[PDB]
Every structure is written in C-alpha cells, then in structure tokens.
C-alpha cells in the first residue's frame, strides 16, 4: 500500500479555501491522521482518526473520508497555515504537499560573484551566481565559461518560501579548478525565470 | 507533555547509534512511542513502536534486523538504536509519542506529542571547520555582497550579519552537500550601492561542531575602493 497526496504543491492566497486530497493505493483502514510542518521543526497532529480536530487545532481545518479517498480542507487559510502537510495511517506517511503563498510574479534581481582572492590562494575558483527574491519558484540557471554552456560542474540551492514576501531565493555554485579559471576569461550566468520576457545574463570578466 | 531528545550525532559507515528520547508529563508505561525519521527535504518515515509497558516491539521491514528499540521506565526514557549505518541513515530522528493509552486498545498509531528531533550525520567524513571567503560586493542601485562559507563538516553552521544588527535582505542558503563529502553554503545580503564607502560588513560564521567562530569583514574590491 501506498499512500498519494495531491497536489504536489498547492498555491493558494490568505483567505482562500484549500482541499488536499490523499488518496491510500488500497484499502489499510478508515483511521487517517494529518500532520503539519514548518521548517526546522517537528511535525504537528491537525486531524486523527479521519474527522476529529487534534487539541489546539482551529476550527477552520476540518478532515473527511473513508476507505480510501480522505481529504483535508482549510476554510480560509491564515498566514500561519503556510506548510506541508502530511497524510498518515499506520506505518504509510503520504509524501506531502506543500502548501504555499502564491503572489504576484516577481523577476529575480540577479547578482554575479567572481571567486574570492583568498580561495584562489588553495587550488579550487567557486563561482556563485545568486537570484534574489523571486516568484514563483521555478527558475533555470545557465552558466557559460568563455561562451562555452556548463554542464556537470554545478550545484544550487533554494530558500524556504520567505515568511514576509512569499519570494524564493537561489544560489548556484560553478566549481572549477584554479588552472581552469585562469585560463579563461568571461563568466556569465544566464537566469531564465517567468518574470523575465527574455533571460537575463549576468558576467564579469576575470582579471578585470 | 514534554519528549526531550540527545544531542546530535556524528558516524562512519558501519557505525550504530542510539538516540534517547526523555518522557515528562505523563504516566511514561500507558502510551507507544514511536520512532519517526526524516532525511534532509524529504518527507516522513515510520521505523517503529515499543510498547514502554512490556518493552514489546515492532520495527518497520526496511529495518528489522537494524534496528533495536528499548526503555528504561526508571527514568521514563526510550531509546532507537540503528545499527550498520549507511550515508543513507542521514536524517533527523523524532520520537512521537501515541494519542491513546495501550489500556484502551484503540488505535495506536496517531502521533500527538513529538521530541524536538536528532541529527545523526553518517558519512566517512571527519568534523571539520569551514573556509569563509568573501564575496565581494558587486558594484562601485543595488549591490549584493556575502561569505561563502565552504568545506564544513558536518551540519548545522550558523551566520548573521554585523553581530545581528543587520537582517533586512540577508539570505542564507541551505547548504549543498559537494561530492568531496563536505558541505559548503552562501550567506549574501543585498545593500544599497551608496552605502559600500561608508558602512562595514562583517560576517559572523558559527560551527559549534568543531568550536570554531570567525567574522569576516567583506569589503569592496581594492579596484572599488575611494580611500
């Protein structure tokens, strides 16, 4: 058995009505439990036993179902009901949704940083490419070495949806050896995301 | 209710560890706890309950045979030992408590109190102290500046700004874990251009795991500097 949340990831604005459904792939029981998240922190009991608000709780989250479609609904969320959340019965944990703030589209503001002189110093160049306070989420970084598209050599990270504005964050880390960052000379990160009509690419040429 | 659990945990590959997790605020023998664990960004998985009562167990298959649960009532504590670990077993482990008494002999298996959780790193890494490098701000509008606080091990660092007193348009990231087997993240603020002459930035680099601290100063590049 397994147990499928829908959706993956649900946006949605304060005062709006949320559904989320999870669904078991066979029928374990008719006890299901919802659990809450928020970063950094240990899940929280919303509904046990399919229908019954944990102590707590307000009244807005309410859950229903049996067999095996079940379904948590929120009647106007609240900025503190930003968070994944979790279906459970026995050993079977759903694998989430996220439920996050949708607001208007934001381009990212994008910043290029040449490798520091000290890390130069060790043997290794880090390139970081940053794409600040955007929405929504989805974002594509390119970097180009001497016009030569990157593949490979790359890692990223993302924020957690900020609390305040409800933009993403990224950083994205070229990893070169030193000799090959002295061979060449221009950087460039290339950022394409919905808020921009066209990508946008941000460089510097090594030395200069 | 409270549910206290030990401190984070360092191991190699091949290694057991075991987690306590301390009960208050309740009769410790009238509830299953369960073990619940959680690897970095992904979701919840169940490992298993011991009855405190009885000491009776059961483990999830993905461990049976790895995995030993046990408690003292004496001092109302539960324990999770995971043994031949794996980089794998990388995770947060919680402790949550059930919502009914086992005299009930109801439905065991809503969680309604859960420990604050326990990091165990596994990895053939060994505890190591990050490089921090500037990252210079990136003009003479709106500039951005940071730390990128490279080669650490293992999780968790902490950074602030200017002691604390700088927050607005701090971003810092998760950490990525680099195929070395260290972990490397940026911590960047972005800042008003004009400000760059006049005013310090200083990063504050905590990684209480190796006992090191380190404030960086970030300053213009000598190419953008006027005195």
């Known amino acids: 058995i397994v147990l499928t949340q829908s959706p993956a990831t649900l946006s949605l604005s304060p005062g709006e009505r949320a559904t989320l459904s999870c669904r078991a792939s066979?029928?374990?029981?008719?006890?299901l439990a919802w659990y809450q998240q928020k970063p950094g922190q240990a899940p929280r009991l919303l509904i046990y036993?399919?229908?019954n608000r944990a102590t707590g709780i307000p009244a807005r989250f309410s859950g229903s179902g049996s067999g095996t479609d079940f379904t948590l609904t929120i009647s106007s969320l609240e900025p503190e009901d930003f968070a994944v959340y979790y279906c459970q019965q026995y050993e079977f944990f759903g694998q989430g949704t996220k439920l996050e703030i949708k607001r208007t589209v934001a381009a990212p503001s994008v910043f290029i940083f040449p490798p520091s002189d000290e890390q130069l110093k060790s043997g290794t160049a880090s390139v970081v490419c940053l794409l600040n306070n955007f929405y929504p989420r989805e974002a594509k970084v390119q970097w180009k070495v001497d016009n030569a598209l990157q593949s490979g050599n790359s890692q990223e990270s993302v924020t957690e949806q900020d609390s305040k504005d409800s933009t993403y964050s990224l950083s994205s880390t070229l990893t070169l050896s030193k000799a090959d960052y002295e061979k060449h000379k221009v950087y460039a990160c290339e950022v394409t995301h919905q808020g921009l009509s066209s990508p946008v690419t941000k460089s510097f040429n090594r030395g200069e | 209710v409270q549910l206290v659990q030990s401190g984070a945990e360092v191991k190699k590959p091949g290694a057991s560890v075991k987690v306590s997790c301390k009960a208050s605020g309740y009769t410790f023998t009238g509830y299953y706890m369960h073990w619940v664990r959680q690897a970095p960004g992904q979701g919840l998985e169940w490992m298993g309950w011991?009855?405190?009562?009885?000491?009776?167990?059961n483990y999830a298959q993905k461990f049976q045979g790895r995995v030993t649960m046990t408690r003292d009532t004496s001092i109302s504590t539960a324990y999770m030992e995971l043994s031949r670990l794996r980089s794998d077993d990388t995770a947060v482990y919680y402790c949550?408590?059930?919502?009914?008494?086992?005299?009930?002999?109801?439905?065991?298996?809503?969680?309604?109190?859960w420990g604050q959780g326990t990091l165990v790193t596994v990895s053939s890494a060994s505890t190591k102290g990050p490089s921090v490098f500037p990252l210079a701000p990136s003009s003479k509008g709106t500039a951005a500046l940071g730390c990128l606080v490279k080669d650490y091990f293992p999780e968790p660092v902490t950074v602030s700004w200017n002691s604390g007193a700088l927050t607005s348009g701090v971003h810092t990231f998760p950490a990525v874990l680099q195929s070395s087997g260290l972990y490397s993240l940026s911590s960047v603020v972005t800042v008003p251009s004009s400000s760059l002459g006049t005013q310090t930035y200083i990063c504050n680099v905590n990684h209480k795991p190796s006992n090191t601290k380190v404030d960086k100063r970030v300053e213009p590049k000598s190419c953008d500097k006027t005195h």
């Open positions: 949550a408590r059930g919502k009914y008494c086992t005299a009930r002999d109801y439905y065991n298996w809503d969680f309604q109190h």
């Open positions: 011991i009855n405190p009562n009885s000491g009776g167990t």
């Open positions: 066979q029928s374990v029981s008719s006890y």
């Open positions: 036993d399919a229908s």
